[PDB]
Amino acid sequence: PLLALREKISALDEKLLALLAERRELAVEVGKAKLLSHRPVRDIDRERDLLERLITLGKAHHLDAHYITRLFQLIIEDSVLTQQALLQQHLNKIN
Amino acid sequence: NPLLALREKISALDEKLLALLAERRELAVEVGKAKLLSHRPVRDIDRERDLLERLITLGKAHHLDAHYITRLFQLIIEDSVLTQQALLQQH
Amino acid sequence: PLLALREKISALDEKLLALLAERRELAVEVGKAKLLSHRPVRDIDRERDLLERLITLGKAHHLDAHYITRLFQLIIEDSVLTQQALLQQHLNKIN
Amino acid sequence: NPLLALREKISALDEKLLALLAERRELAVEVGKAKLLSHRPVRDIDRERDLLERLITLGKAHHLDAHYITRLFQLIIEDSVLTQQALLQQH
Numbered sequence: 001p002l003l004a005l006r007e008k009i010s011a012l013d014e015k016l017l018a019l020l021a022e023r024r025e026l027a028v029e030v031g032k033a034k035l036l037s038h039r040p041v042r043d044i045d046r047e048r049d050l051l052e053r054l055i056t057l058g059k060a061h062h063l064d065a066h067y068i069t070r071l072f073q074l075i076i077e078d079s080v081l082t083q084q085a086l087l088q089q090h091l092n093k094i095n
Numbered sequence: 096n097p098l099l100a101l102r103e104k105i106s107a108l109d110e111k112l113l114a115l116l117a118e119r120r121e122l123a124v125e126v127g128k129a130k131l132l133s134h135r136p137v138r139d140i141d142r143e144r145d146l147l148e149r150l151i152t153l154g155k156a157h158h159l160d161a162h163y164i165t166r167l168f169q170l171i172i173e174d175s176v177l178t179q180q181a182l183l184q185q186h
Numbered sequence: 187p188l189l190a191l192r193e194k195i196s197a198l199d200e201k202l203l204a205l206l207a208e209r210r211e212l213a214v215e216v217g218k219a220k221l222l223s224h225r226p227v228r229d230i231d232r233e234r235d236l237l238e239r240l241i242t243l244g245k246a247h248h249l250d251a252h253y254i255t256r257l258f259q260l261i262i263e264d265s266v267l268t269q270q271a272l273l274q275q276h277l278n279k280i281n
Numbered sequence: 282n283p284l285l286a287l288r289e290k291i292s293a294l295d296e297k298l299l300a301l302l303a304e305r306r307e308l309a310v311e312v313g314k315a316k317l318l319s320h321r322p323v324r325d326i327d328r329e330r331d332l333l334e335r336l337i338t339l340g341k342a343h344h345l346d347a348h349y350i351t352r353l354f355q356l357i358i359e360d361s362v363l364t365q366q367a368l369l370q371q372h
């Protein structure tokens with residue numbers, strides 16, 4: 001009976017993976033937009049808000065706040081570094 | 096606004112992630128019930144190895160590196176074991 | 187008779203001035219394009235070519251090479267600094 | 282190409298500048314003939330002061346600063362005096 005469920009889990013994980021790829025593509029686009037707008041990569045205000053929104057909505061699914069924070073902390077960290085990778089490249093090229 | 100239109104996309108995407116994480120917890124509970132009757136132990140380090148390896152393989156196609164995938168999924172699995180062990184201690 | 191000619195000179199100078207403003211607007215646009223393309227402001231190859239072209243065409247108008255060089259050296263210097271002003275601003279904003 | 286289309290505009294503009302500089306030299310020659318008959322001296326530091334001040338005023342409207350205008354026009358005037366003094370030494 002375990003094999004049936006594990007097969008569902010593996011399918012779900014593949015969907016998570018796809019979304020994670022998509023969010024990473026979005027962070028690159030966002031980084032591009034920051035170069036034009038002359039804004040820095042990191043934006044603490046936005047992260048503060050985003051997390052509060054996620055913790056509020058997570059509550060409805062019974063996902064706890066600390067689980068959501070530990071998880072989005074990795075996701076945001078990754079998207080921040082991805083953008084910083086493009087900034088550094090950019091900075092070496094124009095300079 | 097350039098910046099704004101993307102963020103709305105990000106916020107919508109993050110909303111979909113929450114739904115999948117909760118659903119995954121549900122499935123972990125089900126697997127929790129099965130190990131109860133079947134009386135199997137919660138942790139199965141071998142399944143976790145194959146699951147992670149498969150995701151790292153699928154991820155390269157998406158241009159997601161193994162480090163980020165390993166870290167993110169170990170946390171999801173960590174929570175998943177926590178979820179099952181709770182179910183067991185309630186029975 | 188001098189006043190008649192001086193009146194023509196002043197009109198000509200105003201046209202030169204307008205072109206100088208226009209070339210400065212073009213250098214800003216070019217600078218913007220360099221930020222997207224990730225290219226540095228200065229391009230020695232382009233300046234080398236541009237000057238050779240100007241010296242060749244100048245010959246037809248009887249303008250000598252050294253006069254043309256002294257003059258375009260100021261014009262190019264100015265457009266280089268104008269672009270560097272936008273790069274510096276940009277760099278302080280994204281960083 | 283973004284970079285290329287602008288450069289063609291710059292190259293065309295530079296071509297117009299050459300035409301005006303040559304024409305200006307012609308006028309300086311004419312003024313050279315007038316000072317010959319009228320027997321006036323080539324250099325007129327007073328006309329140069331008013332000419333430069335006027336250009337600096339017109340230039341602010343174009344967002345061109347006084348430093349660049351002064352430097353560029355002093356060279357054009359410098360060449361202009363050189364042009365006239367040559368005409369005189371040929372007569």
Ligand SMILES: O=C(O)[C@@H]1C[C@]2(C(=O)O)C=C[C@@H](O)[C@@H](C2)O1
Binds near residue numbers: 083102
């Ligand atoms: O500005 C942004 O929107 C992006 C996305 C980001 C996130 O991961 O959600 C949120 C805020 C910023 O610090 C970083 C990370 O850039």
Ligand SMILES: O=C(O)[C@@H]1C[C@]2(C(=O)O)C=C[C@@H](O)[C@@H](C2)O1
Binds near residue numbers: 006123142176179
């Ligand atoms: O048996 C299982 O399949 C479930 C799910 C789990 C996971 O989270 O993927 C993988 C293996 C086990 O350690 C735990 C966690 O139980």
Ligand SMILES: O=C(O)[C@@H]1C[C@]2(C(=O)O)C=C[C@@H](O)[C@@H](C2)O1
Binds near residue numbers: 213216266
């Ligand atoms: O790349 C460019 O085209 C612009 C214009 C410029 C010039 O003044 O003509 C020529 C070459 C570059 O060094 C600078 C100055 O940027």
Ligand SMILES: O=C(O)[C@@H]1C[C@]2(C(=O)O)C=C[C@@H](O)[C@@H](C2)O1
Binds near residue numbers: 312323358359
């Ligand atoms: O008398 C003149 O008007 C001409 C032209 C000139 C200039 O280049 O503008 C201005 C004043 C004089 O010194 C010389 C140079 O002769």
